[PDB]
Symmetry: C2
Amino acid sequence: SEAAHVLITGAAGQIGYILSHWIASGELYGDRQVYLHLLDIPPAMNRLTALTMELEDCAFPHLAGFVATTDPKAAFKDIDCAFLVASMPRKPGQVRADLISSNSVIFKNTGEYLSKWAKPSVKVLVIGNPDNTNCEIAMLHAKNLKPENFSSLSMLDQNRAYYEVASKLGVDVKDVHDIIVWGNHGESMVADLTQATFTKEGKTQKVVDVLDHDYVFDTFFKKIGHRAWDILEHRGFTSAASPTKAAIQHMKAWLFGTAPGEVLSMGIPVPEGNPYGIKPGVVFSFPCNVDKEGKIHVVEGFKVNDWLREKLDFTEKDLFHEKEIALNHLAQLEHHH
Amino acid sequence: SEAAHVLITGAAGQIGYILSHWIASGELYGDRQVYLHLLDIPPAMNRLTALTMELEDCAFPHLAGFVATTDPKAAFKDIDCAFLVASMPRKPGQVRADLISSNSVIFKNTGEYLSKWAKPSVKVLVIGNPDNTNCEIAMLHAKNLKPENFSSLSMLDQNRAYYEVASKLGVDVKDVHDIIVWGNHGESMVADLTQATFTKEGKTQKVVDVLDHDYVFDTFFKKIGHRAWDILEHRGFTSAASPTKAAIQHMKAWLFGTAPGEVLSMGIPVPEGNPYGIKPGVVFSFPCNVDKEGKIHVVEGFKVNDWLREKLDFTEKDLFHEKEIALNHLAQLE
């Protein structure tokens, strides 16, 4: 086989540091070698050089080579997949609308670089926030690519939710099933327990039939919704290993397929045929599986109760609004030129 | 199967952060679950809590649970293996004897904890500097353990050397063979290329027959010798992912055995009757393999030319001297 070419943006940061080593160790592409394209900005290049020196010093058999660069063409040329980690952080005094706006330019440019230089088969995983909207913008501005080339990361939130629920029920994570994170990130994300089941002592029950309503429909989302802040409070920096774990997990599933019974929340361009009443035109987290050919499918058969319907509708509306903000910002910049 | 209990000292640090997650991912023990024991000091407890929260947020199927503590008994109780990452750093105006001395107390205490609380089959990998001497001291003070329970990490240096030589030759790492790191860390470490071969265009040749003398016996060791500093200069912090990679590599080999033909440099209590003329009584890096029962063996058949003999003798002398410093310090305290 020829080595698989993998792009990591923001490569000098903590996520990039861990992700690059994890991929180079063979965890993503199995027996196949990898060639890492490591992109960052000029002020980060000494830290990127340090990363590459550590990669070298692992003597990884799976690592065919790498390029550490500030240059888009070198970073995107003939890539097979991409981890779009880099994004503009929110500035002091900015609100969510301004965060969406500042990122829209970045992700427009990135969509253009992908279209120009990446393989037509590239799988682009958008991680930098606001990820669903960044993903939509990159896709809209990638003229030679298709919706199947893009997704956004919701597995960190799914993983968080599994551990919380398993701990609450006093079981292992393997004994909880069908927790789903739907829709957007941010305030409108839907951490849905209404499908979920668990096995304890040979009895299988629905999570919402056992746990208190006040837990399920208030406390639980608060714990999930604020978890990142709690780590930053203790760590002094945001999470790194946990989003990396989720990122690899998503990409590996996307590349080679999911396991029987496995349901992974993934942000995808909304499929026209979807069975959950979501309108095409945004990137929306759905319960997904992936076939052996690397194609993502929304899992059929989940139930939409009145609570879930309302939550889905609200997060759908939120995504269309974010899209509007991003597109309007881009239009206003163009007008001003 | 019952979960394997794995200690990481210095757990809140950068190595601990990555090592914990790597192990919890299933990479060390295979299908078997792991129960992590994460030890650090009181001012690091908030960072340690943060680490546990990220571990939780991975929903690792292999993670049976964890202790995160400042308490030695909770950290060492019934452990199957240990990554002894923590050590006392060198203080500003301190010399090497002081580094050995300060760490001797720590490692004496650690050996005592291991003997008192760990399983008798515990596999102890010493990483914190000065690792060979710290390992010796821990072993000497672990009354219910044996030499087979202890080793120290020299694989980071081996991996660095493979990269460097493969890059100088313009070949893949997989096409270079039998590079060995012998002896102590620090200035007396022996980065031996005198056994090494490489393949290219259907020919296998000795490295020393192709590369120039000035590279092999001067430039190369300087590169290996300044590598960690160069990374610290660029990174703003010391290496973390690469020692973690080497640590898991060593421990996994130690648990399940090495692959056919594989030679891993490992610091081990010197075996009586080793074939390389090294005196028992210190922990010394040798070319090793590991059998399917998890027992480490020195690889036989390497050759010791005059250059290598002198290097081996010098690093042996150095190790015995560090041990004397450590033991004299502990004796003065008693």
